[model samples]
Structures are given as C-alpha cells and as structure tokens.
Target chain A: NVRVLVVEDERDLADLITEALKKEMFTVDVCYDGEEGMYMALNEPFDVVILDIMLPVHDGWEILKSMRESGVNTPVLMLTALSDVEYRVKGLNMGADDYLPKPFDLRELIARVRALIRR
Target chain B: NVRVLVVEDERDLADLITEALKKEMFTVDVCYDGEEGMYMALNEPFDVVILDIMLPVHDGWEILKSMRESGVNTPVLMLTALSDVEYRVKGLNMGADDYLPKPFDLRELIARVRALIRR
Candidate 1:
C-alpha cells in the first residue's frame, strides 16, 4: 500500500482528498496543521507527501526546506493557491517534485501524485 | 567553462546561440542535423544538452527520449517551437529536465544553462 501524507488546512479539501485517495486504494493520512504534519512526516514512513503551501504553526515552504535539508528525499508535491509562474519556479527550485495550484481538478492532482510516485 | 551541445538546424540562430553561449563562457558545439547531434551527445561528456525539436534524420524529441531511455541523465533542455501547453507537459513527462521555446531571449537560454550547470 502506498502511504501519502496530506498537509491541508481546509477541512473539506482534506476530506475530499482523503476520500479520493482511498478510492484509488492509497493509504492516506491527513494533517490540518503544519506542526503536526512535520511531526508525522518525520516519524512516519510515507511514499509521497501532498503538501499545502499555506499552513498555520509551520508554513509549507519551511517544512519542505527542513525536510529536504534533513535528507528526506521523499517526493513532495506542493499544493498552492497562488498561480504565479514565479511560485511554481520557486517550488521547483526548492526540490519540490511537482506543484499544483489550488482549484485544480481532482484528476490533475491524482495524476501529479501518481507521476511523482512513479518517478 | 561548461560544455554545451546546441542542436539547432537553422544556421543563423545556431550561430547566434553559439556566439551567445561562448560569450557566457560556455564551450558550445552547434550541430546542424539530428544524427550528428546524437553521435556527439553520446560521444562527448557535455555538461548540458540544448536540443532542437525539429531536426533532420531524428527529431529532438526522439533524441531526448533515446538518451533518457539509455540511462543518460546529463540534464537536457529541449528547444521546441511548439508552444502548446501539452508540448511542455509532454516534454516534462518524458523526462526532459527543462524546455525552451524557440525565439526565446538569448539571456534566458544563458540563464537556463547556468542554472542547470549549477545544479
């Protein structure tokens, strides 16, 4: 079973992602706060992480930088609300495997998740 | 100096690329055809490859796919005239590290080359 850690602040979106992943047969863990998310990511073994760029307690960008700096090469796909091209470039340069802007289709999210895992 | 392979068929643009890359302190090799380009890419130890999509004998896409399939991860930055979002998406999906549209600024090409080499 593929384990995925979803760090999302929105309750509905988190629930939606969880249900969608479960349907796809992926074991999913959802975290609403960045602090807990980081704790789980550090303590747990996950195949992929769907990280939201905006989170309370610990921002998503800092979490990603910390994880990567700590030698965690687990593929990360950033979920951001900003659609600026620079944001995408920043995420990519920061070692994010992929980035999907918010309001993206569920299928697009799934595709990115699968592609990151495959790579 | 970083060694760059510029696989562009158009003589004028090819010359311009070579000149600009040279000015930027890169050792540039400009190839007019795909077959020779492929041969050089395989034989030479280049720091980066700037592949043109439309080439004779073998297309840029073919060369890139072949190189990646053969386990060559020497970062390739594809040059294509195709601006369709699907083209960029497909190129990324096909293992291209980066894609540059034709008629792009010489500075952009230089920046990409430097960025890739620095990576």
Candidate 2:
C-alpha cells in the first residue's frame, strides 16, 4: 500500500485529511506537532507528505528546511494559509514537490497529492 | 554553459528551432540523423535533447529506447506530429521528460525547454 504522512495541528482537519486519503486507499500517518512531524518525515519512508505550515513547536518551515539540510527528498505538499503567499518556486529553496493554499477543495488536495505520487 | 541537442530531419525546421533556443541563451547542437543523434545523446553531457520522432537510420523511438536501455537519464523533449496520438503515452513507457506536438509555438517550445532545464 502507498503511504502518506500528514502533519496538521488541527485535530478535526487532520482526521478529515486522513479520512479522505484513506478512501483513496493510501495508508496515512498523522502528527499534530512540528517536531514530531519533522521526525516522522525524516525517519519514515512515506511516498509523500501533506504538511501544514502553521504548527506547534517547530513550524513547517523549519521542518522543511531541516529536511532539505538533511537531504530528505521525499515529495512534500505544503498546506498553507494565504497570508505569506506561498510561491511554488520555494520548492527550489526547500525541495517541496508542491504547495496547497488553505480553503482548498478536497478534490484539489487529492489531485495534487496524486500528482506528487505520480512523480 | 547549458547545452541542448536537437535532432530534426527538416533542415529548415532544425535551423528555425536552433534560432528560437539560441535567443534563450542556450547552446544548441543540431543533428540531422537519428543514428548520429543517439550517439550524441548517449555520449554528450547535454542539459536536454529535443528529439524528432521520425528520422533516418533510427527513429526517435529507437533512440529513446536505446537511451533508456543504456541508462541515459538526460531530459528528452520529443517532437511529435499531432496525428497517431501514438507518441502520447510512449513518453511514460519510454521515460521522456516531455513531448511537444508539431505546429508548436516558439514561445511554448522555449517555455517547455526552460522547464526541462530547470529539472
């Protein structure tokens, strides 16, 4: 089975995210803290990750930066709220496969995740 | 310097193709035969290759397959005619980086090549 790691601070939304992907037949591991999220991301062999930018402890930026510094190239799709204006080019600096802004459709989330899996 | 190899039997098109990429400041190497193209593609260190589907001695299919068989992972953008709808999925099966149908705009060609170079 394909595996995905989802790191979101919101409990309800994390469950929602896992539910959606579970229906798609992907095994998902969920974490609510950035520190543990980053650790799981670095240690586990996930096909892809759905990472929320805002988090307790380390935040997604630090996790992504540490992942890059540590040479973990697992495909990562960032979950961001609009304020910072996520640039896809950040992938050049941080090595994410793609980013998803908040208020996104679940269909788009699945589509982007599917695209990353294809990669 | 970034290098690109273009294999097109149409000399007019080949020169025209080279001109478009030249303005992008990419060094372009033009070849007229698939046999020669396969050799250069395998032996040379190029950022990318613009390959035409129909060519003498070996078709682009043969060259692409041979490149994969010989473990050449340099990006290849295939030039294919609109009909036959054949070369479409041959991309995934053969591992081409991308494919452009003939009758493409020079802008789109340069844009696609730019994308491949970034990869």
Candidate 3:
C-alpha cells in the first residue's frame, strides 16, 4: 500500500484530509504537528508527503530542509496559506518539488497528490 | 484553457509528448524547430512551455534565455538528456520552473506540467 502522509495542524483539516485521501485508495497517515511529522517522515516508508508551511515543533521549511539534507528524496507537495509568489519560489528553491496556495480547489489537490506519488 | 507549448525537433519524441500530456487534459501545441517555437510562444499566451535542449535554428537553452531577458515570465519545464544535477540547477537558475532529464517517466512529466500550470 502506498503511504501518503499529511503533516498538518488544525485537527479539522487533518481529519478532513484523512477522509478524502482514504476515498482515493491511499493509505493515509496524519500527524498533527511538525515534530512528530518529521520523526515519522524520517523513519517511515512514505511515497509522498503533503506538508504545510507553519506547524508546531520545527516548522515545515526546516523539516523539508532536513529531509533534503538527509537525502530523503520522497516527493513533497507543500500547502501554504501564504499566497505570495516569492514564498512559493523560495520553497521551490529550498528543494520543495511543488507548492500550492491555500484555499485551492480539491480537484487541484487531487492532481497534485497524484503527481507527487507518481514521482 | 492553459496551453502547454512543446518545442522539440525529433518527430517521434514530440508526438509522444503531445499524446502523453493530452491524456492528462492539457492542451498541447508542438513546434518541430525553435524558430517557430519562439515566434509562437511570444505571440501567443501560454501558461507553461516544455523546451527540449537539442534543436535546430535556435536551441532550447537560447530560447529560454531569450524568453527570460524578454520578460516572458511564463513557467518553463526544460527537458534535457543529460543526467547531471548541474544541468538541472542551471535550468532552474535560468528561470525554468522545473527540469526533467530525458527518459523521465511520463507521469513525472505530467506531474511537473500540472505543477507549473498550477502556478
């Protein structure tokens, strides 16, 4: 089973993502904070990871940096409430594979999820 | 509808790309040479362009540099046969939003295309 880990806070949103990804036949794991998310990510077999920029513990950017530095090349799809183009570019420059602004369409999310997994 | 411009000289590869992207519902326009590709890319408004490095008339790298200098901020996904990380970094530095080596999976190409257009 392919694992799609969701590293997000906001319990409502995390649960919602878990429900939606489960419908897509994905084995979904939800981590409510960045520290646990990073721990699981570094030690788990995840095919793709859906990440948020702000989180409790380490922050999404730091975790991503660590992931890259550790040679974990699992594709990542970053979700951020920040709509700034520079932030998006910065995330990409910092080794993120892709970024999506918040309030994005669920269909677009599905597309991004598919893209990251196929990586 | 966002259009993806594919510029490549090889007939087989161009057609293969068109067919592959079309399956993902991306409207694709193809040019066999760089000269026509540049002309069309300038005149028309395309969201993303997939440029192949090896071409006649004008090579893909030149076209990309021109586009950047000309202030064409349209996202570019550069395709190259070189399996070197330097080339990938160079492409991203040269204003290409993404880079994929040749013989890359069709799924990755489509995923990158989706990521660029989602920009």
Candidate 4:
C-alpha cells in the first residue's frame, strides 16, 4: 500500500514506472511538469516522490527545494540524465533522499524506490 | 486506490468501517488486536490508520508512540469511546492526526479520515 508520485515528464517513462509500482501494490499518482508535480506532492500524502531533474514549466531542483522549505518532508528520489558529481551533490544537499542517474535499469529504479520509502 | 487499516476489537464496528471505506473506493486491511495492528502498520504502508484506545495486547497510545519513535509517520485517527478532553489531548500529543468519539457518525468518520490523509 505504498503511495508514490512520479514527476517524470516523459510520458512513456512515467507510465512505465506507474505500471510497475502498481504491480508492486503501490498506489501511484503521475504528473508531467514541475508545477503539477509540486502541486500533487504538496496536496497529497505520498510515501515517496520520484522526481525528474529536467522538466518544463519548472525544474526538479526548484521543486525539491521549495517542497523542503514548505515543510513537505516526504522522501524524494531524483531521476535524471544529468549524471555528474555536482548534480548529485546539489540534489542531495537540496534535500533529495536519493538520486538515480539516467539510462538506469527499471529494476534498479524500483529497488531504489523500495529502499527509499522503507527508510 | 487508497489503503486503510482498521484496528478495532469490535467486529461489528470494524466491518462497518471496512464496508464504508470500500464503498469510497479504498482498499482496507482490518486487524482485531493491538499487536496485529502495530505489526501491520509497521510492515505495510497505509494512507490512514483508524485505531481504538482500548484494546487487547498493547493499547492505542503505546502503538501510536511506538510508530512515531520508529519513524512511521502515517497519519492516524483515534476512534474510541474515550471522549474526554484529556484523552483527546493525549492522543494528539502522542502524534495522532485526528480523534473521534464513540457513537460517532460513520459519515463524519469518513470525512475526518479524508481530511487527515489529504493533509
């Protein structure tokens, strides 16, 4: 009964994560932009938030920082193609609980999600 | 679908809450005792937990405190016959999100549950 929010703008990827998480008995809510993602995460209680660093309307970093500042302490796992030490450090310092680089195995993504929420 | 846990020793009341929540499109798990309730809450994720203060094997206050200490911050709503102000304060202080007295209206219970989880 874990609840998750997927904030990836790629429709296919978002759908894939949604389907996989649902199969694992997690209730998922999907949003395509930073604005919508922030709104959904702020308005709803989700165990974990899967956020993409690059997004339209707003970006993941801003969203994450704002959420943390607003007292939304729900764990966030950043998923993005920007795989670099600087990006990872910034995300983690901005209150992200975990970070997954792009070109990642979906299996690993699911495993990371499980680990993040279990914490 | 939303998931809920009902921890009431009264079979009739537990069934009633389950039926009502199901009608609202929630997936529910019910336990008849405090031990089972705590085990389920810690092992699984639920949108909201409905707990009774008087129960066999652990009591609601102990369960609530243990959950908070364990970092399981899932919102909890206390539903019991202990309507005294002191008990209500105690429940809230121990990390309960909401409280409802016995002989309560089912509609109000559902509404309170919705509000607690939505927050």
Which candidate has the top score in TM-score? 1
In candidate 4, what are the lDDT values of residues A3-119, reduced to their tens digit?
999999999988988999998899999998888987887788899999998998879998888888889898788899998656765776567766667877676577667755654
Q: Rank the candidates by DockQ, best first.
A: 1, 2, 3, 4
* DockQ-based CAPRI category assigned to the predicted complex of candidate 2: incorrect
lDDT (Cα, tens digit) per residue for candidate 2, span B45-117: 8998899988999899888898878888887888877333344455534677666678766765666576556
Q: Which candidate, 2 or 4, would have the higher TM-score against the true structure?
A: 2
Error of 4 at A63 (Å): 27
Give the per-residue lDDT of model 1 (tens digit) for A1-119: 79999999998888899899889899999999899998887778899999998899998898888888888888888887966657766776777766677877676577557755655
Candidate number that wins on TM-score, 1 or 2? 1
lDDT, candidate 1, residue B6?
A: 89
Off by over 4 Å in 4: A1-119
Candidate 4 chain A weakest ten by summed lDDT: A110-119
DockQ-based class of model 4: incorrect
Q: Which ten residues in a row have the lowest lDDT in candidate 3 chain B?
A: B83-92
Off by over 4 Å in 1: A14-26, A102-115, B1-33, B43-52, B73-81, B97-119
Backbone clash numbers for all candidates listed: 0, 0, 0, 0
Residue-by-residue lDDT tens digits, candidate 2, A1-119? 79999999998999999999999999999998898998998888888888888899988888888877887777777887732332433532455655566876676577657755664
Winner by lDDT:
4
Clashing pairs in 3: none
Candidate 3 has a DockQ of 0.06
Error of 1 at A9 (Å): 2.3
